[PDB]
Amino acid sequence: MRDPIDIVIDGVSLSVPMETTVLEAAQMAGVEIPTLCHHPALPPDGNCRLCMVEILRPGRRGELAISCMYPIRAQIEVNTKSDEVIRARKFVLKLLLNRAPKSARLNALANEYGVSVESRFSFDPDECVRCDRCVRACETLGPSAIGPAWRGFNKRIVPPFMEPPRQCIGCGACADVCPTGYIECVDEGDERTIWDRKFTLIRCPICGQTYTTEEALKFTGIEDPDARLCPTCRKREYASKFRIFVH
Amino acid sequence: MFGYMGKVLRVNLSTKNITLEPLRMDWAKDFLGARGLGSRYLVEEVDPNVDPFSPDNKLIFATGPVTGTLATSAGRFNVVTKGPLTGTIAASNSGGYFGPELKYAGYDMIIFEGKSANPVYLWIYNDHVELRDASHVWGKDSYETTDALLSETDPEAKVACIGPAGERLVLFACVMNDKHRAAGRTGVGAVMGSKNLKAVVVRGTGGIKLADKEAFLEALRKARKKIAEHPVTGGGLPAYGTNVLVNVINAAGALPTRNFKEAWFEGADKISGETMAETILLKNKACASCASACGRVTKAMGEIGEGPEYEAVWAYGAQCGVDNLEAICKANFICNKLGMDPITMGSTIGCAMELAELGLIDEKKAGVSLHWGNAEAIVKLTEDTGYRRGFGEELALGSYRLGEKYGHPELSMSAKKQEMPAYDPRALQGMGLEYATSNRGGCHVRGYLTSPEVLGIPEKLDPTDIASKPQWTKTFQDLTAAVDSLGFCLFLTFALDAGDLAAQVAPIIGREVTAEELLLAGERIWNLERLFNLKAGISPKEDTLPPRLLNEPIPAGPSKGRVNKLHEMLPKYYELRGWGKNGIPTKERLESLGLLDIAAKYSL
Amino acid sequence: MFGYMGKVLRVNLSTKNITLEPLRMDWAKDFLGARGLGSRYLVEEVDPNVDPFSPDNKLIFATGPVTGTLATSAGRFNVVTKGPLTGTIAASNSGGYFGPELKYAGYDMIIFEGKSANPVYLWIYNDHVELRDASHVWGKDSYETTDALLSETDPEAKVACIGPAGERLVLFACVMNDKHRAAGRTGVGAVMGSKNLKAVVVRGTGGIKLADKEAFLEALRKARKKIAEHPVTGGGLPAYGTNVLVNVINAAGALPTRNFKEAWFEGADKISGETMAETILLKNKACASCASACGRVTKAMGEIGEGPEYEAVWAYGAQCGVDNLEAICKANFICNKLGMDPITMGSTIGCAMELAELGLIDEKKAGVSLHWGNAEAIVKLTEDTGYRRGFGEELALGSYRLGEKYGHPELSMSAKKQEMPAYDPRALQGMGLEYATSNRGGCHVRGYLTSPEVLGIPEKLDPTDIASKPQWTKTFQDLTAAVDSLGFCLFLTFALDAGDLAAQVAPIIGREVTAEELLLAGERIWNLERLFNLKAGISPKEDTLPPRLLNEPIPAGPSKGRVNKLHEMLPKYYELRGWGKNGIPTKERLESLGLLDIAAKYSL
Amino acid sequence: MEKVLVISPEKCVGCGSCELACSLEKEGECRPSLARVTVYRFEAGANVPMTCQQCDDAPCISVCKAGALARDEKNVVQVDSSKCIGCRMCVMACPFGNMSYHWEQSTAIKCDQCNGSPYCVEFCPTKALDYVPADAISLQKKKEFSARFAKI
Amino acid sequence: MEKVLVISPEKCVGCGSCELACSLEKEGECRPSLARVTVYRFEAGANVPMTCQQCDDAPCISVCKAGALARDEKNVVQVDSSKCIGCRMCVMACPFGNMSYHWEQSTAIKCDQCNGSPYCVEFCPTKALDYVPADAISLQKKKEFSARFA
Amino acid sequence: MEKVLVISPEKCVGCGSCELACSLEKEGECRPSLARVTVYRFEAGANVPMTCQQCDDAPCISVCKAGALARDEKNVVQVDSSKCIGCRMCVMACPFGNMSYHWEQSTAIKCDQCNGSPYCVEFCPTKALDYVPADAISLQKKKEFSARFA
Numbered sequence A: 001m002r003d004p005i006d007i008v009i010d011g012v013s014l015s016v017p018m019e020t021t022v023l024e025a026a027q028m029a030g031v032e033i034p035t036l037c038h039h040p041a042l043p044p045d046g047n048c049r050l051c052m053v054e055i056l057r058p059g060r061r062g063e064l065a066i067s068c069m070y071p072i073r074a075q076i077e078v079n080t081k082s083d084e085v086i087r088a089r090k091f092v093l094k095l096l097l098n099r100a101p102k103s104a105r106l107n108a109l110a111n112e113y114g115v116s117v118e119s120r121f122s123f124d125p126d127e128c129v130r131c132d133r134c135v136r137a138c139e140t141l142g143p144s145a146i147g148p149a150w151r152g153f154n155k156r157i158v159p160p161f162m163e164p165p166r167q168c169i170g171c172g173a174c175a176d177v178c179p180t181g182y183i184e185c186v187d188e189g190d191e192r193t194i195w196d197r198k199f200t201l202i203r204c205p206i207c208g209q210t211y212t213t214e215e216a217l218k219f220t221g222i223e224d225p226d227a228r229l230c231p232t233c234r235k236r237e238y239a240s241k242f243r244i245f246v247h
Numbered sequence B, C: 001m002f003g004y005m006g007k008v009l010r011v012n013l014s015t016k017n018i019t020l021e022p023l024r025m026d027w028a029k030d031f032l033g034a035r036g037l038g039s040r041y042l043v044e045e046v047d048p049n050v051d052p053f054s055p056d057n058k059l060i061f062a063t064g065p066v067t068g069t070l071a072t073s074a075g076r077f078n079v080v081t082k083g084p085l086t087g088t089i090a091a092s093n094s095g096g097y098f099g100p101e102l103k104y105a106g107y108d109m110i111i112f113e114g115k116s117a118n119p120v121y122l123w124i125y126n127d128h129v130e131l132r133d134a135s136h137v138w139g140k141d142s143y144e145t146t147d148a149l150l151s152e153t154d155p156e157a158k159v160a161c162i163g164p165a166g167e168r169l170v171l172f173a174c175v176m177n178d179k180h181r182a183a184g185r186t187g188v189g190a191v192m193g194s195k196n197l198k199a200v201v202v203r204g205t206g207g208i209k210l211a212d213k214e215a216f217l218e219a220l221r222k223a224r225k226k227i228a229e230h231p232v233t234g235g236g237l238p239a240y241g242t243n244v245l246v247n248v249i250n251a252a253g254a255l256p257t258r259n260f261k262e263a264w265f266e267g268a269d270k271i272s273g274e275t276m277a278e279t280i281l282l283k284n285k286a287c288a289s290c291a292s293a294c295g296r297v298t299k300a301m302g303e304i305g306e307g308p309e310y311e312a313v314w315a316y317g318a319q320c321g322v323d324n325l326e327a328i329c330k331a332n333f334i335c336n337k338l339g340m341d342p343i344t345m346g347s348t349i350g351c352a353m354e355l356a357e358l359g360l361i362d363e364k365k366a367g368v369s370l371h372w373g374n375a376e377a378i379v380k381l382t383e384d385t386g387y388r389r390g391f392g393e394e395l396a397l398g399s400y401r402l403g404e405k406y407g408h409p410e411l412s413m414s415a416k417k418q419e420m421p422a423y424d425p426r427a428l429q430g431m432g433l434e435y436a437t438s439n440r441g442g443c444h445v446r447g448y449l450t451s452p453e454v455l456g457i458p459e460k461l462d463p464t465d466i467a468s469k470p471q472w473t474k475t476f477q478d479l480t481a482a483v484d485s486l487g488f489c490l491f492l493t494f495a496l497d498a499g500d501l502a503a504q505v506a507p508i509i510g511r512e513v514t515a516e517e518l519l520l521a522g523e524r525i526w527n528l529e530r531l532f533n534l535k536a537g538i539s540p541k542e543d544t545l546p547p548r549l550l551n552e553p554i555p556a557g558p559s560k561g562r563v564n565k566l567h568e569m570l571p572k573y574y575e576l577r578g579w580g581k582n583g584i585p586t587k588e589r590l591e592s593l594g595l596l597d598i599a600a601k602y603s604l
Numbered sequence D: 001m002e003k004v005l006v007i008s009p010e011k012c013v014g015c016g017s018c019e020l021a022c023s024l025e026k027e028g029e030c031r032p033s034l035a036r037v038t039v040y041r042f043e044a045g046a047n048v049p050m051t052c053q054q055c056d057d058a059p060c061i062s063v064c065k066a067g068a069l070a071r072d073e074k075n076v077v078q079v080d081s082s083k084c085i086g087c088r089m090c091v092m093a094c095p096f097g098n099m100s101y102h103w104e105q106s107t108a109i110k111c112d113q114c115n116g117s118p119y120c121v122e123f124c125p126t127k128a129l130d131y132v133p134a135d136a137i138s139l140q141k142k143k144e145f146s147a148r149f150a151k152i
Numbered sequence E, F: 001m002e003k004v005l006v007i008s009p010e011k012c013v014g015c016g017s018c019e020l021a022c023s024l025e026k027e028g029e030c031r032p033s034l035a036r037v038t039v040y041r042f043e044a045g046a047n048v049p050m051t052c053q054q055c056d057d058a059p060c061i062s063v064c065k066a067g068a069l070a071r072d073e074k075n076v077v078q079v080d081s082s083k084c085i086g087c088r089m090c091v092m093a094c095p096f097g098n099m100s101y102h103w104e105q106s107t108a109i110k111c112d113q114c115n116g117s118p119y120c121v122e123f124c125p126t127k128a129l130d131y132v133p134a135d136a137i138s139l140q141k142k143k144e145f146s147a148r149f150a
């Protein structure tokens, strides 16, 4: 444990520990900073460049840094509502919104920051902001099925070799971790289609309900036949084993 | 929204059309819910002169604003239709866990109109509502129907179903929820059967939003303290159910015996709640969000079912003279399975016994010995009436029509063609006035005058007095109407006044609710029901009691030598109600209550 | 270190500051524990000349190294303070299950210092200690206080409390644990009530560590075999409790009767232990890990309670001249409820009876007859003294102060203002020497010379012999001091000697312990307490007996015409003790016992 | 653990107030399906409540790879809702079905003892749910049964 | 089943030596909280020692999903602490409170009859705890009651 | 209650025919260990037969939780062998030792009076076991059995 450092965010003094990001300091100090790519469960990447803040150092001018990753090791003053910060956020928001105009998250952010879609600067709007959230979620889960497959403006998150992924599991965490809702995970009856691959779902024998696929349960290595029961059915079946004695 | 869900499910059984419509929130303000709002919808839609078994009649499952919430004993709902037994408006309250599940699926009401060509049942899973063929379950009892429908729809769903008695159009059939909870009186189950509706199966996964959670929690803690401290709702009901009243009522000499011929039953000790708790009570069971556990789980004659409640015990006990607690429990189980009225069944059995005493009924025609106290007779006749086998064909018409068939309608202890419960009007004047003035028949929990007269819950009253009785009866009826509409245990009136209920309701629905507002709403509901009944043909001259309770004094017991003075209390009740000497609501009273449009519609 | 928990819980009732400090291990080596260690702490931290009710006085709950373990009868603890009744140092031992629970929480000792502004009680759950308001339990007796405090702290906690008498500062009040075990003599409950401390509630789930389990188990097996084989610990105590001594002492002509006016009681058979076993003894109860189960569970006057032990029976009977065992048991139950001293209460009642025999106390003022053998008088005066109302205001001062007020201090049978407990010194010379030379007043357990002179348990001694009495008295006092400090039953001395107790202790605490080491420790403890008393103003001239014993011979009985020869044994006792002719410890002796620093502190 | 949740199914009356209290505390509304305790009502009035018991060797913790499941200082398995990606592996791994998934909030949900103030215990009318120190987990039931021999 | 622990609560004096012996055998220290037998001292001197009687149906076994509860060749329900996951469901399933949970070791604890050498029986001074063959389980109490008539 | 079993120890000779008859009726073999009546022989030829007398305040019923112990029309306490879960709790609850446990069939065993056909009374040479109807003497004998307690 190192000595905590005292820093000032928008005129608010606070002692934060060593090796703590600016975003964490703002979160514990009640300050709100917009983020798109950062996920607290995934190894940070700093892609979207939307959580820009001004870092003012003793004798040094304010510079833009990403709050989601910039650590607090010295005495600095952070400004989140500066004109330069607002201009940078407007620029990044314009780019992201032109990339994904139908997104609710980006439209909400634009309404917050007064940004409108431009028809001249909308090249290939495909509802993907390349935040890499899905790739990192897949990597942390254990199956590294999906991954980026190009560089530049043509960058895309695809299954390997542009075919139904051979290492996908069907959990659907990549679709859950997606700001723009570009990934779709549709379930019809006992079928789950994600990344244009069909996964068979599991139905509990006394309920007909579904919460996971066969591939996911095989991946987790849970050989208990109760794992195929839905949580309510499994809970009821276990609770039936308790012979309550009314006398 | 807050308290209510705002959605009404309308199911047309004739055309297989299911539609969603918003709940009328102005009617919700004037008529809180459950009985009140269901009555308002029935008045708006159902013509009061319709035949109860006609497709034009409607069956409404209505929940209250607080139903499904953590509020004390807020798990209740009503079934509203036109009663086939009485011809009045029939508002049937059941609790259990069906009303909360209906509100968890996102509905405040279900309306059933028309008649399905084939036996069908309604399956509700949140917003997914569909009618399904019920030919396989048609004919099974409540337990088998519930098991099959749960096995084919959802294990966690709740089933409100009729038994064979409802399918055979027994005039005192019932709707059974949770296999033991019954919304049973003045038909209701017969109406459901006449529409070829076997059951309603609902599975709710949504929530009920409150306005202020913290204020509701504070009021709930206060109410829970008051309930737990109270002797009845704290120690009495959880330990002896509602059957605790057997010794209390009999000690006052107000327990009708041998078809209201006597008011004191010497076999009371064998059938009392204490004896049942000692001998056959397996456990106690609580309705949705109920601090008390008035439900009995008993095992009698090798079978296990929800134990007989006080009125059932009297109807198969003191009413028939049977002191066999196990036989009473078995008859209650048979009623639960077949979907019948233990009060009406027991009163009709007692009327048949008294007719056999006069020799009008042959023991070979009945198929069993109709002597007082025959424990076999109650079970045999209950099964026969449930399946309409031989003599059951006559017992399935109720005690009033059974007496009419033999030329002795005066032997039927019923007001407005609905048999009276276990409280002798000759010993309790307030109960006599309540039986006369109840808006659906001989019901006693429309206004429970027994509470202050015997239990002395609001104030210990003299059962012989007839002076303060009209005002107490009116207050109890209006308070009961409001409590029914809200969706609370009416047993909460033993521990809580309208202040606690309002303090719970106001942070739920989101508006300032006071006791005076609830009383006014209850009076409005009661007058709406009276307008419906008057249009339907129930003349004010039927606000009377059988001549046995008016001219024959009690022969023996602690209440020996007492008659009912209804002729002296009824005019005062009419004056206090704002109604004329002819019992019809006046224009000024309707203007005060806001019921002018209804009265103009009915042209009374 | 094993055996000891090694923690002291210091509680300052003035500043509400609760602190935890390490136990002084050097003092634990010099002074084994419990009585000795607590007395050493008191000598260190309390000026001997302070007032007992002053906030500077301290109340100490101390446990021995073996308390709470499986060692034979190892469930004992001491309450150490400066006694208000005598002015000497008070070391009050109680057993039951409170001390073991305190060591299970993790504390060897509790020190209460200062006075609390409001009535408070201490609550201990292992390492969680907090002072809680005790205004709702203030004024209640031991049973009600224990029940309420268990309800609001923990069902399985142990409560050491005071009754109304301790709150009212009765000079012979006590600390009450388990509602029936009492640390009663010299007024430690008065000290507890002067600090506005209602009770100590402790709950503990920790364990006591032993250095050698197998050696301890073998020593325990041998000790249990010896205890079972012995007639007293094996049969006599389990069969007739401590009350078995009534016939054994009355047949020896050494049972004081009617304020020591006689040594033989004619109604002794009706109050003996055999009569109690045959009439009112419900059951027997054992202390923590006690294999003798000397405790009595009795029913008298319609009430259940812990039966009167031998000195309680004597004080309320032979001392007061009553033979009604029911009244004796009821008075003992009243003492247990209110937290009073049955020996001091009974002796004060007997002194009042003797004063009334002289026409000196107006029985109209007392409100009850004070004639010898008034079974109602003991009960009524016990209640009045427990509440300090009426004549009980006088009886709350003890027999010595009662006589001093009325000009007859010699009619009080007390040594150092503490009443002499149930063994007549005129028939037992060693008992007279023990009464004179005891460190806390008229005490018989500081050295139990009845054991050789009547029971012949160590070795049968002539009750009239005086030559060997001083040496046996010194040995008994040192052995008892060591046993008290260790935490065993002193009844264990009936079957076991210092060798067996040391053989049990050594594998527990983890160091080699011998009988000679225990005797030296007991002598050191006795000399430390003597130094404290001498610095507290207790002049050696207090080592005497009332002139009735020294001059008046026994009038009748097996020991007719005998007096106490204290003047022929006291100088020899002083010589053996290492003290001078003046009764003050010499420099050489205190050097041999390592008490030179204490004497330097006291400037004696 | 300092204190533990103790379930006595013999005392349960099936009112379901525990579910409503838990849902009111957690989701802000009366929604029994999102409660962390579920009461199951069987034949003959045998109702038993079931909730997470904070297994000392928890399969749910052993199966999670996002680091959203961890034991706190009070020996309670806690879900970090910000770290939950929705794989639902903890739902499969729990052998009793005490771990559910809140689809609207996109997080696994399990009992957390309300961080020391259980509402289900507070609003249980029969003490079928109790909050007792871990060192006395079964003392009360044992004393209740042992009292049947003392009345003899 | 060879021998059975037999409890006679009318003989118990409440000394609590059984708890101390059990805790000394199991944990190595005098710790009545972790003993497998607990004596409860009620009013009127009625003391009841309570411990596992090795139910032949054993409701505790029915709810153990890890297989840590199993009956031995001596008809004693035993806890395999290496397979116990700490779910504490057997404490909930036991209707008598005879199953507890060891918190410092994270396992279920119940009486195992000390593998044929009950230390609670050895150090019980009143024979309220006895270890008799299963074929004669009530013969001693019956003989004592019959001698009252002799 | 119609008929009760009356024990007269002053008449017993110790032949053990009661145990043999009861075991023959119940187990199908002469196995006195599994008999519901046990005769104890004391010095000076004092023989005491002991069996369940269906005491009015029966601890065994009040202690059993599975509900397998329930009184019947003849006031005879009977065991539902299908319900018993193997607890010895009724054995400990009985203060007389008249409730035993069948260790091979895993069920509590007690004198059910053979459903009104007492074989032990049938084959008692000295009539120390009888089946007289309930009257003042019969109830006095029952109290001498149970109401003495202690």
Ligand code: SF4
Pocket: A127, A128, A129, A130, A131, A132, A133, A134, A135, A157, A177, A178, A179, A180, A181, A182, A183
């Ligand atoms: S698919 Fe969704 S999560 Fe993946 S990079 Fe594109 S926007 Fe981000």
Ligand code: SF4
Pocket: A137, A138, A141, A143, A145, A146, A165, A167, A168, A169, A170, A171, A172, A173, A174, A175, A194, A195
């Ligand atoms: S659903 Fe398939 S691609 Fe998406 S996170 Fe799971 S394993 Fe990876």
Ligand code: SF4
Pocket: D011, D012, D013, D014, D015, D016, D017, D018, D019, D039, D047, D049, D120, D123, D124, D125, D126, D127, D128, D129
């Ligand atoms: S609140 Fe208590 S009694 Fe009611 S269902 Fe829940 S656990 Fe059972």
Ligand code: SF4
Pocket: D051, D052, D053, D054, D055, D058, D059, D060, D061, D077, D093, D094, D095, D096, D097, D098, D099, D110, E087
């Ligand atoms: S969620 Fe299931 S596996 Fe995890 S601690 Fe709770 S009960 Fe155990």
Ligand code: SF4
Pocket: D063, D064, D065, D066, D067, D068, D069, D079, D083, D084, D085, D086, D087, D088, D089, D090, D091, D107, D108
């Ligand atoms: S659903 Fe959430 S808590 Fe459960 S294993 Fe997956 S990431 Fe962990």
Ligand code: SF4
Pocket: D021, D022, D023, D025, D035, D036, D037, D051, D110, D111, D112, D113, D114, D117, D118, D119, D120, D121
């Ligand atoms: S302790 Fe809290 S989170 Fe757990 S079930 Fe009870 S209310 Fe729900």
Ligand code: SF4
Pocket: E011, E012, E013, E014, E015, E016, E017, E018, E019, E039, E047, E049, E120, E123, E124, E125, E126, E127, E128, E129
């Ligand atoms: S050792 Fe024996 S007498 Fe002592 S508490 Fe245990 S069972 Fe009772």
Ligand code: SF4
Pocket: E051, E052, E053, E054, E055, E058, E059, E060, E061, E077, E093, E094, E095, E096, E097, E098, E099, E110
């Ligand atoms: S732990 Fe409980 S349920 Fe299991 S065998 Fe022992 S007493 Fe029976």
Ligand code: SF4
Pocket: E063, E064, E065, E066, E067, E068, E069, E079, E083, E084, E085, E086, E087, E088, E089, E090, E091, E107, E108
């Ligand atoms: S606590 Fe251990 S022994 Fe008990 S049920 Fe759970 S895994 Fe089995």
Ligand code: SF4
Pocket: E005, E021, E022, E023, E025, E035, E036, E037, E051, E110, E111, E112, E113, E114, E117, E118, E119, E120, E121
């Ligand atoms: S037999 Fe052993 S484990 Fe069982 S209670 Fe006795 S000492 Fe404890």
Ligand code: SF4
Pocket: F063, F064, F065, F066, F067, F068, F069, F079, F083, F084, F085, F086, F087, F088, F089, F090, F091, F107, F108
């Ligand atoms: S046989 Fe066993 S389980 Fe059944 S009642 Fe008797 S002791 Fe209880």
Ligand code: SF4
Pocket: F051, F052, F053, F054, F055, F057, F058, F059, F060, F061, F077, F093, F094, F095, F096, F097, F098, F099, F110
């Ligand atoms: S088995 Fe024992 S307790 Fe039960 S009825 Fe027979 S004698 Fe009484």
Ligand code: SF4
Pocket: F005, F021, F022, F023, F025, F035, F036, F037, F051, F110, F111, F112, F113, F114, F117, F118, F119, F120, F121
């Ligand atoms: S009556 Fe029958 S069961 Fe009872 S002892 Fe005699 S043979 Fe055995």
Ligand code: SF4
Pocket: F011, F012, F013, F014, F015, F016, F017, F018, F019, F039, F047, F049, F120, F123, F124, F125, F126, F127, F128, F129
């Ligand atoms: S058969 Fe009769 S005489 Fe023979 S042992 Fe049995 S009771 Fe005694």
Ligand code: FES
Pocket: A034, A035, A036, A037, A038, A045, A046, A047, A048, A049, A050, A051, A066, A067, A068, A069
């Ligand atoms: S959130 Fe920090 S760069 Fe994207």
Ligand SMILES: [Mg+2]
Pocket: B035, B091, B092, B093, B484
């Ligand atoms: Mg109603």
